[PDB]
């Protein structure tokens, strides 16, 4: 197996990859990343990041019952939420171009575009394209190579 430490930094790297396949219709100068709810592996991202394309990632932890999440965040990394909470949050985002990614990969039928599988020898994710199509951000299909590049030994 691995370490919480290591795995955190891994979430950092796989996130950063996914960002590169995404397009905001009105691309902001600083990408705003909102970590929302209980997380195990968002410590890394919370340190902040910078993209390969110059842009810095400004990351804060945010509250589930914030209504204006959708304008406050370009990227939401969603933590542990019950079904009701999850609904609230996605009503917060509904409309606004916001990418969405879960720490856990059990909740991928409605809600997030990407769902991570983080325990285990490599990080993968499930992808929901209805969710993606609904997002209002442009996501390129070749991003799906990030999930199986590590699912392949």
């Amino acid at each position: 197996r691995t370490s919480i430490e290591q795995r955190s930094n891994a979430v950092s790297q796989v996130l950063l990859g996914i960002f590169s396949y995404v397009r905001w219709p009105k691309e902001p100068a600083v990408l705003q990343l909102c970590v929302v709810g209980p997380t195990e592996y968002a410590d890394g991202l919370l340190r902040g990041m910078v993209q390969a394309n110059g842009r810095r990632v400004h990351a804060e932890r945010r509250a589930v019952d914030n209504p204006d999440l959708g304008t406050l965040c370009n990227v939401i990394y969603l933590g542990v939420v019950d079904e009701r909470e999850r609904q609230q949050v996605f009503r917060s985002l509904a409309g606004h171009p916001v990418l969405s990614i879960s720490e856990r990969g059990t909740e991928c039928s409605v809600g997030s575009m990407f769902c991570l599988n983080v325990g285990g020898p490599r990080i993968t994710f499930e992808a929901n394209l209805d969710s993606i199509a609904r997002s209002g951000v442009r996501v390129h299909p070749s991003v799906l190579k990030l999930a199986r590049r590590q699912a392949t030994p």
């Binding site: 590169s20 394309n53 039928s109 929901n128 299909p141």
Partner: protein, 123 residues
């Protein structure tokens, strides 16, 4: 982060790509039939050969019926993926019925967006 080099080519996951169904219908208007072929071709070109298809209904109806409805919707989409190259076994079919909405069923709009198949790509 190789995704930055991507020009205008192959962005087949836009708003148009939603797979929606008419009230009580479980068969794909040729608009969506094509949408799907695009998608299914798009998945194959990146060496993904396996997906899970989850069907949903809106609100009207009793659950049992809508469950059965949703499954059919899913299987109608599966056939396209089959006709596009994907091994049928690599195509999981699930029916979630009215249980898991993505929109307000208290609204006509919402209900349309709920009668959908959702393509999920597993890792």
């Amino acid at each position: 982060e190789q995704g930055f080099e991507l020009r205008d080519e192959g962005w087949e996951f836009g708003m148009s790509s939603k797979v929606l169904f008419g009230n009580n219908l479980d068969r794909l208007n040729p608009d969506s039939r094509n949408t799907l072929t695009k998608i299914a071709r798009a998945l194959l070109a990146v060496d993904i050969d396996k997906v899970r298809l989850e069907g949903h209904t809106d609100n009207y109806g009793d659950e049992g019926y809508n469950q059965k409805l949703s499954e059919r919707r899913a299987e109608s989409v599966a056939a396209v993926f089959r006709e596009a190259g994907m091994p049928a076994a690599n195509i999981e079919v699930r029916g979630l019925g009215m249980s898991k909405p993505v929109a307000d069923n208290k609204t006509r709009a919402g209900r349309s967006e709920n009668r959908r198949v959702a393509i999920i790509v597993p890792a």
